[PDB]
């Protein structure tokens, strides 16, 4: 369970390889989670309103 997102996760998708999970949430940020690591490697910002 990944809990860095503090708002509703609108969309969640897998990479075609599947090692990375992209979660786009109400927090304006898109977090990429490394499944083997279990950590948010990248936290894409820049969206003024909800993703």
């Amino acid at each position: 369970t990944f809990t860095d997102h503090k708002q509703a996760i609108w969309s969640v998708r897998f990479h075609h390889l599947g090692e990375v999970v992209a979660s786009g949430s109400l927090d304006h940020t898109v977090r990429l989670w490394d499944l083997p690591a279990g950590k948010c490697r990248m936290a894409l910002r820049g969206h003024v309103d909800s993703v």
């Binding site: 990479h15 075609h16 390889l17 090692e19 990375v20 990429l32 490394d34 083997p36 490697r41 990248m42």
Partner: peptide
């Protein structure tokens, strides 16, 4: 970013 840089595979 473990394996986020592969060559494009399975163009389909």
């Amino acid at each position: 970013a473990s394996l986020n840089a592969p060559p494009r595979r399975n163009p389909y």
